[PDB]
Design a protein around this ligand. Sequence first.
Ligand code: SF4
Ligand SMILES: [Zn+2]
Ligand SMILES: [Zn+2]
Ligand SMILES: [Zn+2]
Ligand SMILES: [Zn+2]
Lengths: 417, 355, 752
Amino acid sequence: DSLSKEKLLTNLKLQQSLLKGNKVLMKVFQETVINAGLPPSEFWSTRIPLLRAFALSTSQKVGPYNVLSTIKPVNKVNVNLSREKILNIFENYPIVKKAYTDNVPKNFKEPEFWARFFSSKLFRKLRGEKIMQNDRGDVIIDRYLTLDQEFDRKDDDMLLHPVKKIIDLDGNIQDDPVVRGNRPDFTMQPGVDINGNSDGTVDILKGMNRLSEKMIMALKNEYNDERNELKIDDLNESYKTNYAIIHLKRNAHEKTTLKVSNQQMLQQLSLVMDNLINKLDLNQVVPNNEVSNKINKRVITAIKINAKQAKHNLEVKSTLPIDLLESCRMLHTTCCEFLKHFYIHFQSGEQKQASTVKKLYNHLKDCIEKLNELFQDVLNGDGESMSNTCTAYLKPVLNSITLATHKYDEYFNEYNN
Amino acid sequence: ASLVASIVEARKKRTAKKNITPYQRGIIRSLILTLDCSEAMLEKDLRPNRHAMIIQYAIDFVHEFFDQNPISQMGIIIMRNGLAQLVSQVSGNPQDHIDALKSIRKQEPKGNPSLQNALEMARGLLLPVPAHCTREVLIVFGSLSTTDPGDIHQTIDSLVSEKIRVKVLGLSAQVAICKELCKATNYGDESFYKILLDETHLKELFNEAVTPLPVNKINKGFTLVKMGFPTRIFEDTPTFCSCHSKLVYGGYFCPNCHSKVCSLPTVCPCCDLMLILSTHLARSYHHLMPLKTFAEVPTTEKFRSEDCFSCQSRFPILTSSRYRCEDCKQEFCVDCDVFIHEILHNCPGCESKPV
Amino acid sequence: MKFYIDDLPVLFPYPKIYPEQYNYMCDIKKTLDVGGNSILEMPSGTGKTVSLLSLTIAYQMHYPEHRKIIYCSRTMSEIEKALVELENLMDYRTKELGYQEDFRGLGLTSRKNLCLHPEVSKERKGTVVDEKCRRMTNGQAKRKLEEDPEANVELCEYHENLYNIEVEDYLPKGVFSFEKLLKYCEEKTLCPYFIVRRMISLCNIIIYSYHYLLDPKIAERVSNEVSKDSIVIFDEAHNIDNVCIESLSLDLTTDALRRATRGANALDERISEVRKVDSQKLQDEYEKLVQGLHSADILTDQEEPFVETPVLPQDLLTEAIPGNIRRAEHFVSFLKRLIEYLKTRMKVLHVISETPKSFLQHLKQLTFIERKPLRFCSERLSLLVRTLEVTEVEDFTALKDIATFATLISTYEEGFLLIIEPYEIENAAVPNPIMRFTCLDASIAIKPVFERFSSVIITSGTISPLDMYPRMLNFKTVLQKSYAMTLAKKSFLPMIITKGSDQVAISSRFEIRNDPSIVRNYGSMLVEFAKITPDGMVVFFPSYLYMESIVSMWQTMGILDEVWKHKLILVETPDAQETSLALETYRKACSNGRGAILLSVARGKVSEGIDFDHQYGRTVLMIGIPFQYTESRILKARLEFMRENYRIRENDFLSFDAMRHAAQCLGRVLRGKDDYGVMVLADRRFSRKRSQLPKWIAQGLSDADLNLSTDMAISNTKQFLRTMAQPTDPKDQEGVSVWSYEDLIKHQNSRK
Ligand code: SF4
Ligand SMILES: [Zn+2]
Ligand SMILES: [Zn+2]
Ligand SMILES: [Zn+2]
Ligand SMILES: [Zn+2]
């Protein structure tokens, strides 16, 4: 289905779809392929989960439901039609879909059609309403009555299937074919009208049963056992988890990249217990104001250093021209994209990736030179008034990029040389 | 006579927690909470309504899950009007999903549920997930039925085949299909289809769902994983970030490809490798090193001490409230027992006692 | 698990067992020791069939008597249940002993269920199915094909293969299901009906319907190849009196009379043609009747009697045919004037009820036909059909019915009655007269059973009171006791809804049937229970017309549209086949958990062998008292006869039958102890009937539950669902409800 990497890369229409959904994706994609000419497959190669998420979001569909039961008759009536529910009616009733498609594009209008439909007795029959000759219906819609009837016959023919004997009431009533007793009660048998004909409640009940069967066979779509069926689980062994416990052997390496004696510590301990029982003065704790002054110097130096650390506690406010700010952000963004793709190629590790690595290396070099030329532009645009800040802002991505270039050169010298 | 009822209730409670095991429990988690926002949760039957409390409890659940287990990504898909709507991709930042849930606050829950569509797109979202990550889904449900487009059993079979588990927290009562899901997905266990009895029980259930789950021996995936500790810088100049492409005063620096990021514990956007701190990995060590329960000594027997070893307070006097750590042979009060067993994760008696 | 009774080794296919099952086995073995019959009542929520089957198998193997086993039920569903459980038990025993013992046991049913002749299989009337099978495998067809292979009267290759191989070669030992037998006969091209008809003398245990034991026509053959000293058990036959009643009751319609006239004329003209072309066969039949031979005398096994023996064989006439009906033309004129007499008595203007003796006296007053010819009619007709070779028997099935009626009414006089009423439908466009033959007693058909077999076990799950069945049927049992439900915790919650949401009472009375307020209440709690019901719910009205009215007018209110939004709704169709598709739909709907509702009559076809469990049995809407139709002269004559016989209060018996039908309705919820369900009583009048109700049922019926409304019914049901949604510690039931082998040992020592 539409789930492989190849399928997701193939769906150019879906790619354009979420493209048109976003705006920064036009920005990024335009710079990536329109401006830089990157292979758009490798563009989308990162965004594969996003593509699949968009596809699966677009791909779901609802389940069937009794749309005619949700239809209410609502003096006068005003049509308040919902197109999704109109198509729901179409899908649930292909007869109604057919009656739409041979009349509205031929004879009259859609709201006129639906007014005729709500007027029609075919609507009442398809809904849970007993048909009545007092009702006149709509003649145009009610011409489809026998067509819907033979649809019902064909659908019932499709719905017929053999039954399991374990639950077969037909086999149950065919237990004794020579039962000769008495005629059962009118009360518990299906009653009829005065002239022997039925009222049709059996028809409406078999119709709603047909609706149920249609729903369950819609469930039963494309998208022996009695031994298991008759198991009595209540007298069986309880399930126990096979979860594995874990122990932990403990032997850690010592931290890598004079010794005191009991006599000496005991001597000092005796002496300091003597001093402890001897004396203790709070007033002697006051310092000499000179080594204390050096303490003041050290403390104040620490305060100054950490205060300058705290002095640099939406992005930050900047005094850049807004266009050059956007341009440099754009260049940073596409350089980051190039760098990520180059790392994807490099950490892949194949000889098939070699020309890709070389070409992305060329693109990184081009981005470097374009960064330098941008630096020349902000040079002769500022006289290095804040072109220094421009260079420093674009610095770290450039450092990482050129570090990657050095890594590529080093591995080239490692393998080839 | 209330103390006898409290004692027998504590006995019937402790009968479940008598067995404490050092099972291997998942750390690289993958948790999905789908939400239904349908007509059922419009009931004000619990105050103020089911939608509001599940919103609040989901806020708490996000906070607790990210606090305890910051080494997982969190995705939320809402269910509404016969459609399941993705609102939260799996991410390391909880704040994104917090904002998405805040959007879910003001909107109106309505419609009917479709676990088939919900679990199908949850499966699809869970598809590009690495092997060590434990794919598991929490599902909240208030209906007693489910309108669906097609079969659920094919989805059940596919989910079992793709090694993803589920846990259902139903609202009203048991639904047999949800029981079937929990049993078949959960190796025949019935310890996953849970029904609350009040909002406090719902709170307790959410807290239970916070915890990591044990893994199975047959589901063996024992391997290594590449890891990298980054380094934080505090620069004078604001600098462009790799992730959000904007000027940052500080930021960690990539250990491998020397780029910079804005938040942790996150993977690299550039060298594409996970970056953490040792605090984050040690955070679950109480799960890795569980604590034994502490036993009250009986009031009839002679007592080692008459006041609490840890908090240093007098033991109250019918029964004896002296919870003993047999690993350190010291008895403690109930308050200290609660704190050491839940908040703390070490026994100071065992810290003082040399091994 | 396996333990020993005092001399009886016994194996249970599960490690666990219930103490109620243990006491049940104890009393059954006591009964088997003492000899005779006993009545035991047990809560059907515990396992029954497996335990009794294990006891019977152990009894046959351990004791040197090795008596056969007779078990009978109502439906193919119950028979298949017994087959599956028996297969599981014998498989477990084979595994436990490490080897398979020699064993034989099968069921018994119709060709409509069984005849795999694909051409014959495509008919819906089992009578037509059997008739075609006789037409092309009657032996006469085989002989005609043997003398003339060019004759186009084909034979059933299934039957031919069964001719080829022998009766022990038909099957290996053991038990085979209906499905397994279908696979086997599909493989080997064999007729399973014929197979079963030859397995009768060989099966260690035989299982068939209650009809095959009660009706003489389908029971004499069973009595032929059954051992007199086997073991007989009955299950859930607490409504078997109705089967007994219909075993000897018959009705007469105008069109049947017309078909009888046409068939008699066709037979008369055929006899005239045969007398014209070759009178040798007629003269041979006439002289064979002069010697006085009978159906067993002349007919072989491969040919079957046309008019099957309507009466019990203990009451048959075995002497010669009178000369007045001995000739074929004499017998035709005899039957025709019988038809004419019936047409004369047909055209009465009101309700007629006379004794058969009085009818006989009137008949011998008007015409000159005696009880001896009027009894010999069926045998003479069968012989005439056999000689006549008139196998196109379509016009003569009414002749079979009329000869059956004549023989039956000429056989008995006490506990039987004839009802003639001028309207077949009272409230129709025109009245249509009817003659109805009845059998006022029910214990007539059990007399061959009781006097042929001693080791007969009568037991059920919903039989109450025990003494009422020996009251209504002249039999006695050795011990009469029930079983209480030794429950650890409550699992079933019955409610008695004596009032609606507006504190308005409800009842199912047909006069107040079209009451809109009662409709509003009924639809009200129907909606409420639909909204709170998770998986599966069933509704049981007392009558189909009551349904059709009340469902059509809720369809007018559109309440069903609201019901659509939560579950499916399934209605008992008059077609059993569509009903089977409907119940399959309900089954699959509760399987996928989207939820569905069944609508079936209290006496309807669902209620007699279909169980519901753990999502299917969750909550039941029983609708009112399922009283029978009040103005039946047949019912009133029954009431008069049974009151005259056993001094039975009529209204009390009516309440008895109503509550027993209600119990049969409500007994299909709790399959295992793990299951749970809630019961409702949707009538005000039920509150006086808890004393009537079965003991284990009513023990959960609390005194606060005796008169409830919709609101606390809803609240209690929600709380019950909340309760049953919780797990349970095994320690609370490890020794009081679920018993290990050691638990049973400890209990046995405690008894010691
Ligand atoms: S011969 Fe066998 S298969 Fe054919 S109709 Fe008779 S019983 Fe059925
Ligand atoms: Zn950033
Ligand atoms: Zn990196
Ligand atoms: Zn303390
Ligand atoms: Zn300790």
